[PDB]
Design a protein around this ligand. Structure first.
Ligand SMILES: NC(=O)c1ccc[n+]([C@@H]2O[C@H](COP(=O)([O-])OP(=O)(O)OC[C@H]3O[C@@H](n4cnc5c(N)ncnc54)[C@H](O)[C@@H]3O)[C@@H](O)[C@H]2O)c1
Ligand SMILES: NC(=O)c1ccc[n+]([C@@H]2O[C@H](COP(=O)([O-])OP(=O)(O)OC[C@H]3O[C@@H](n4cnc5c(N)ncnc54)[C@H](O)[C@@H]3O)[C@@H](O)[C@H]2O)c1
Ligand SMILES: NC(=O)c1ccc[n+]([C@@H]2O[C@H](COP(=O)([O-])OP(=O)(O)OC[C@H]3O[C@@H](n4cnc5c(N)ncnc54)[C@H](O)[C@@H]3O)[C@@H](O)[C@H]2O)c1
Ligand SMILES: NC(=O)c1ccc[n+]([C@@H]2O[C@H](COP(=O)([O-])OP(=O)(O)OC[C@H]3O[C@@H](n4cnc5c(N)ncnc54)[C@H](O)[C@@H]3O)[C@@H](O)[C@H]2O)c1
Lengths: 333, 333, 332, 334
């Protein structure tokens, strides 16, 4: 077993834990957060959007047991202090949100971990990886890697096909997003000064920034600088949709050419559908991106075309499945 | 000059138009028609989940109800041609049922004795389709049946007008992010119009849906006919919507702040401008047809190329209803 | 195969369909609603709260296929017209909400069905059955049966235990309910004149009446007229909680006696839990009622008022109960 | 002007600010929180459930201006450090949730404030006040007062009438509550170890404890220890309902007697309705409690009656209006 520790037993940490239970040879030996074993065990077992955990969870004092397997729990807000050397950690899933930087995340390496995979975009000389778009950039010598963002994971395969098959000139993105835990429950001061994330998460359409389209070049260099865009955060608790509006090089692009090109590029990470689904239908899915042929649009005036595509993603589980694929790749090669 | 109005369909738009007409001198609602008793109609006027309590006094009689001592006749006739409009001397019917959205169908009110019909939606037939303060001057006063267009068209037209007049519109795609409406189901259930997406629980989903606001924009601004396309995403807010517009303009050295100034200069009673980081509930109850949001403006350029992106808020209920009542008052005068 | 037809392919119809797939020897041969095969197939496949249907659904013209099994679909708003004699229907699950009366439901028997199980409380000389509380009242001769209500199904096993083990004197109930399709999406005239169910379902706490406590005597006669209560419908799309506040005959009762008594009575229909769960955590569960030991309260002044709470997925909890009763009714 | 400062510009602080604008001779001169002026001004101006603030708000550096009136803003997490002596504060509305104790709240008095009114239940030798039920307990010598809870404010006038008119034997309460800011937006570790408040606030029915019924004796002593109950927190962002199930001393009570007794006791703090309203209809209302005659139930077996009533409250504005009435009463005594 590849010995994994999860730092930050949040939405992404707990779902990565559930996902790892379904992946042979991957094992979570340790978990770190800021609370007691009873609260960690409870939130693994019960999950508002993702459902009950099928396995048996029981609290001990080391931490908790899952199907007889013991998971050590810790409460260390500073990652350098974690006993990773004593537990022989191979890879930390860094899912706190507070170590989104190569140097900060190095704390886990000091602590005795062999490698750190960060469950978000991160600053520093790091590779930023979307599984099945650029995971092959990983050579096995990396110490600290970023798993990029949920949006980037919905967007990169779509953008890669658009550029490979048609040539991407430029594009603007809107992602329509499930609200997340960095948003307040009720209108209140926001810790990062964001006057929109300050607002009641579940009662608003809230515009917000994203670096997914601006920083796409980190996963596909060829289209670096060719995209921009923002998010609208809306009151569903998970499940999201990326809409992309592009100018292509080819000007006799068609709705069929785009769909077929997406269908043909599909894999475990990039799915394809022609059903008139809605956001609830993608909750718990394991594609990093699900291309929706029903939303494809080509607009033309005189000769010039504007193309528009949409892809679904469960910002939780789609992203988590991608993260676990990358983990598994990083542990093996 | 008490212009005598009858409201057909005392629904979201009908009730709100009633409330609006109380605030507008010389407009009077003498009659109301729906499919339920006076008690139910009076109660829904008094109490409104999103728009708040009606300030006036409402009491139930049998002719119908009284509002501030003024008697309103109420009827329950599913067939408009049977309504006693000749006996009540109706000047104008606000047709707000959703079941007469066609010139010939709506003519049923004219047969019944009404002088004019204004339809609270897009409508088929040789009709004028009007966005107040964009093309209300197309009305000459001879019209028998007029369409007040859609909520989305009212949010979009003044933005698109400015973009074309000041920059030249080449082409554009739209996404409106919409509050759910009463044509959507409470729970997943057979939909009456066979729509597999409006079939789904309205308040638990991001729901792609079609709209004609962009495609049919030429009905209100002919110069840009066929230059726009796009759709909607219905999301779980009960009212308050956002129109996002991604355009190619003729001019190519355009900047964020050129665009924002051009909108601010075109602002009026129907077309608001804001630079505050607001969210959807901040527009609930507002009486602008469209509220341009300078904080959302984006210009994306690669090489030569520019894609421009703008956003305008609207309360699909009250924004639309103030527009409808302005057109009503113009049509009467 | 017991040959079932589902009248009304709604929340309860479709979920009974799903449930019947998991149940050997039960088969849905036909389905009736007010829409096309395309819509019906789609809604079976995709479900906002209950998740994707695992099987394969494909539309045909007779109706649709589910894992290669053909289901005939119909569009008859009048049940007496349905070709139940031609299809040899054993039992109809009447799930429209429009035949909730023995005589009205008889329309299916006219049509050629042998039996009708109504997915709701119903008026008439009918048995009203909560599986595992009073299903043994069914002799097999019954023509039209009621499966009672979701709330009744949540309440009956709790109330039975309280009476058998402590003696029930009187009780008030509040059920906190997921909103349902009889509520409006937006404030609008309500077809039954209910000024509260008129209101936007997902934006309000909405008081509403319920006969679960008042008509509890229909399933447990011994406590007839000893309960009353209402509902508060709130903005979750499924999952509900029944709170019961009671006077017991015994007065030295404690939290830990109450919870033990509940745990001992647990079965296929009546679950027990000591986890601090919330409504989400019961979505899709198949217990008719999940007693929550963490909510038990004993209040006393001088010489007691007792308070308990049970979860239920008003959808799946009720459906599962309905399919158990179906299966029991077929097997007599 | 009575010079007021608001410690904690949260839900209750901002709404009390907005309420104080509507009340002549009450003036907010200073505000304290943990953020900048830009965020404080913005959140006053825009309010998801209570709507846009009608007045003009503009940011300055001392703080912000509201209709030309300057409000000083601060960012001091420790209250004793606040310059209350320099600004001559008469009363602090203590609305942080972190000073709900007489001794802890004394920090404002050390700072130079004359009196502190805590927007919550509080421990210590404090009077706990529900305006129009027991505000006459205040003599004007009090240093630190509690304004009780939103539930207590919804409940006390109802319970007072039931006891005065019929004699209260015992009762159980369930309040069905709007979710609040001590709940998590998504399932996540809770700071107070509460495994239910840990869950996604807007996706769940969440049982929770409340002291409103148990601690009713603090505001009406005669019925001390006669009530108990809990809450169910549900996905509305504001607006709540108290249900009260009671045994009364009188046993021939009817729906009609109960409803009349409630109607006769109505005032600026305790409203009465016979309309089939729902929670949204009470958002922004200024009654502390709105009795709902449509929900009154009398259940009887043989001779034994159980009575059930319900009262609405905007846990936000019903509470805030009660708080400001108490504020004004406290200011207009010594
Ligand atoms: N929720 C999403 O849709 C999603 C999707 C993609 C990426 N991400 C990223 O994953 C990261 C976590 O997001 P999330 O939604 O799970 O947040 P949530 O919040 O969970 C984070 C957990 O980390 C814990 N934590 C915080 N600081 C800690 C510390 N110093 N030491 C140990 N534990 C600590 C918290 O207790 C919480 O349990 C963020 O970077 C986020 O941007 C989230
Ligand atoms: N966001 C919006 O709510 C919005 C915006 C712009 C336009 N509209 C248009 O306004 C119209 C009404 O929409 P709504 O949202 O108010 O819906 P609604 O359901 O609230 O109202 C329609 C009302 O008319 C009644 N009615 C239906 N058929 C009738 C008949 N034949 N005779 C008399 N009364 C009848 C219904 O009982 C209901 O009260 C629709 O065409 C809609 O597209 C709605
Ligand atoms: N929580 C719950 O959903 C719940 C729980 C238990 C029982 N019930 C009861 O079950 C029944 C259905 O409730 P639901 O929530 O599934 O409703 P629903 O609205 O989702 O389903 C009813 C279906 O019947 C169809 N229908 C209506 N009239 C018809 C007719 N005349 N002929 C054929 N089809 C018709 C409708 O199109 C709809 O699909 C009701 O009696 C209800 O009170 C509901
Ligand atoms: N929300 C309700 O329904 C309700 C009703 C009645 C009473 N209350 C009580 O009012 C108090 C606050 O409630 P809320 O709902 O307004 O919470 P809230 O979190 O919205 O607002 C509290 C504010 O205080 C600020 N704050 C925290 N610590 C501070 C520090 N010590 N110094 C300065 N400012 C600080 C926070 O930044 C926040 O803006 C609590 O005691 C609560 O129990 C709440």
């Amino acid at each position: 077993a590849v010995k994994v520790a999860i730092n930050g037993f949040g939405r992404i940490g707990r779902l990565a834990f559930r996902r790892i239970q379904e992946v042979e040879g991957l094992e979570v030996v340790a978990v770190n957060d800021l609370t007691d074993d009873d609260m960690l065990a409870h939130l693994l077992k019960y999950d508002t959007m993702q459902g009950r955990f099928t396995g048996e969870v029981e609290v001990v004092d080391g931490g908790f047991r899952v199907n007889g397997k013991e998971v050590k729990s810790f409460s260390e807000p500073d990652a350098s202090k974690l006993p990773w050397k004593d537990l022989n950690i191979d890879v930390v899933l860094e899912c706190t949100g507070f170590y989104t930087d190569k140097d900060k995340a190095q704390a886990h390496i000091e602590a005795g971990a062999k490698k750190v995979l960060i469950s978000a975009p991160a600053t520093g000389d790091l590779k930023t990886i979307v599984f099945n778009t650029n995971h092959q950039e990983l050579d096995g010598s990396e110490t600290v890697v970023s798993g990029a963002s949920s949006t980037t994971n919905s967007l990169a395969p779509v953008a890669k096909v658009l550029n490979d098959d048609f040539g991407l000139v430029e594009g603007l993105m809107t992602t329509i997003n499930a609200y997340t835990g960095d948003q307040n429950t009720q209108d209140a001061p926001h810790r990062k000064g964001d006057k929109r994330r300050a607002r009641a998460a579940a009662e608003n359409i809230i515009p917000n920034s994203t670096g997914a389209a601006k920083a796409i070049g980190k996963v596909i260099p060829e289209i670096d600088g060719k995209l921009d865009g923002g998010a609208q955060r809306v009151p569903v608790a998970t499940g999201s949709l990326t809409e992309l509006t592009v100018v292509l090089e080819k000007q006799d692009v068609t709705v069929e050419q785009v769909n077929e090109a997406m269908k043909n590029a599909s894999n475990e990470s990039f799915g394809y559908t022609e059903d008139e689904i809605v956001s609830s239908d993608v909750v718990g899915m394991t594609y990093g991106s699900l291309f929706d042929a029903t939303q494809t649009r080509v607009m033309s005036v005189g000769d010039r075309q504007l193309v528009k595509v949409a892809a679904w993603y469960d910002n939780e589980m789609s992203y988590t499945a991608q993260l676990v694929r990358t983990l598994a790749y990083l542990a093996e090669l």
